[PDB]
Every structure is written in structure tokens, then in C-alpha cells.
Design a protein around this ligand. Structure first.
Ligand SMILES: [Fe+3]
Ligand SMILES: [Fe+3]
Ligand SMILES: [Fe+3]
Ligand SMILES: [Fe+3]
Lengths: 139, 139
């Protein structure tokens, strides 16, 4: 049984995306509870969120055998990880966010379009900072 | 312009999924850098990860207008957030992870099948604990 090409590979990718989003959603919910004064519920969202971190990183460990789910590229060492991050960030600022910005403007969501443009610029900053770190990597 | 049904809705959901995964991936990479001794790189993966948290939560905020990407339910208040988390967790432990476990076992990935079964049990625990919290909520 080779993981590359299997249904189990696409399920690990899907579950990794879901666990990742669950951690994000639960911390967002924790902050809503914070403001409401629901400190016990905020603590519970935070603790559950740690569980989803453990789940997501377990999925990622299995996916080391087949590649980074965001890029298809090898990950593992810091050199590989920086390489995969630069490629993903480059996709985000040259393709994904500008194209989402265009569609938002075309559909009449001007503020959301400016938000996608703000994020394209941020991901370009991320990309260039990771590239600088890769240039300085001594491994 | 109505966000519900637009291409911009689907793009917010996709970008939220992407930003969520980026934070998880970058923290994973930070831990790899930790063990290698690449502390400057680890610090950069963590700082960048904070940016991806900010991005994902900005996407979620726009999605308040159409519903939780995991469930379709409204979100915002702790009462709503708990109900959505419960519905999502219930799908995970009754349908998603048991189904992935079966596919993995059938494909020859016994360890991954057991992992999916561990996670089914874990999400059931989360679902029940959130339900307890929802019954205790005073708002
Ligand atoms: Fe989980
Ligand atoms: Fe980024
Ligand atoms: Fe980002
Ligand atoms: Fe959970």
C-alpha cells in the first residue's frame, strides 16, 4: 500500500484542512466569549482548539510521505519547509488573492476587494521575508 | 450586492481554509526548526503564523454574514458558536472520521485507520463537552 494516489491521501488532506479551520474557528469563538464575559466557555474553546492542533499536526506527519498539502512539495527540514512556504506564498500574491480581488470588485464587493488586495501585499511580504531567511540558512 | 451565493462567498471560504492551514503548517515548520536548532527560522515561522491568524479571522468576520463555513449555521454569540461547533463535531465523529477509517483499513493503512478511529472518539468527546457547556450557558 502506497499512500501517494490513494483515497486515504485525499482524506488526510481534507481532514487536515478541517482540523486547521476548526482551530481557527474555535479561537475566534473564544474571543467572542471573552468579550461577552463567558470566560469558562472561552477556556473550553481554547482547550478544544489545542486538541485540533494535535489532530492537524498528526495528519501533517502522515502527509510528509507525499508532500505539503498546500504546494505538493517536500517538507521536513527547515530548508524544505522554507522552500515550500515561498512557493505557496508566491502563488498567493501572484495568483490567488489578486484574482479574488478582481472577482470581488466585479461583483460589487469593494471593501472585500480591498481586503484581498491588502492580503496579496501581505503574502508578498511574507514570501520575500522567507526568501531572505532561506538565503541566510546555514544547515 | 448580496454576499450569499456569490463567487466572492466561495472565495472567502477557500481563503479562510487556506489561511487556517497556513498557520498550522507554519507552526509545524517552527517545531521542525526548533529541534534542528534553527531558532531564528522558528521565530519567523511563528511571527508569520500570527499574520495568518489575522488573515483567517478577517475572512471569518466577513463570513458572519452568510454563516459558519463548517456548518452553514449563524455564528457570533457564544450560544450560536457552541451550537455550530456541536453540529460540526457531530458530523466528524458520526460520519467523517469513521468513514475515513474504513477507507484507510480497506486500502491497507492500518495505522492510519486506527488514527482516524482515535480522532472519531476524540471529536465525540469534544461534541459532548460542548453540549454540556451549552446546557450550562447563561446569557
Ligand atoms: Fe479534531
Ligand atoms: Fe503568508
Ligand atoms: Fe495570510
Ligand atoms: Fe474537535
Amino acid at each position: 500500500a502506497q499512500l501517494k494516489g490513494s483515497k486515504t491521501e485525499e482524506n488526510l488532506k481534507y481532514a487536515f484542512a478541517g482540523e486547521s479551520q476548526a482551530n481557527r474557528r474555535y479561537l475566534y469563538f473564544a474571543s467572542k466569549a471573552d468579550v461577552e464575559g463567558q470566560n469558562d466557555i472561552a477556556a473550553l474553546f481554547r482547550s478544544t482548539a489545542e486538541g485540533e492542533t494535535g489532530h492537524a499536526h498528526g495528519h501533517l506527519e502522515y502527509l510528509e510521505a507525499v508532500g505539503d498539502p498546500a504546494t505538493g512539495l517536500p517538507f521536513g527540514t527547515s530548508r524544505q519547509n522554507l522552500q515550500s512556504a515561498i512557493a505557496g506564498e508566491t502563488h498567493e500574491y501572484t495568483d490567488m488573492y489578486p484574482g479574488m480581488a478582481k472577482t470581488a470588485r466585479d461583483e460589487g464587493f469593494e471593501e472585500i476587494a480591498n481586503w484581498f488586495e491588502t492580503l496579496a501585499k501581505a503574502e508578498r511580504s511574507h514570501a520575500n521575508r522567507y526568501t531572505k531567511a532561506l538565503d541566510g540558512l546555514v544547515d
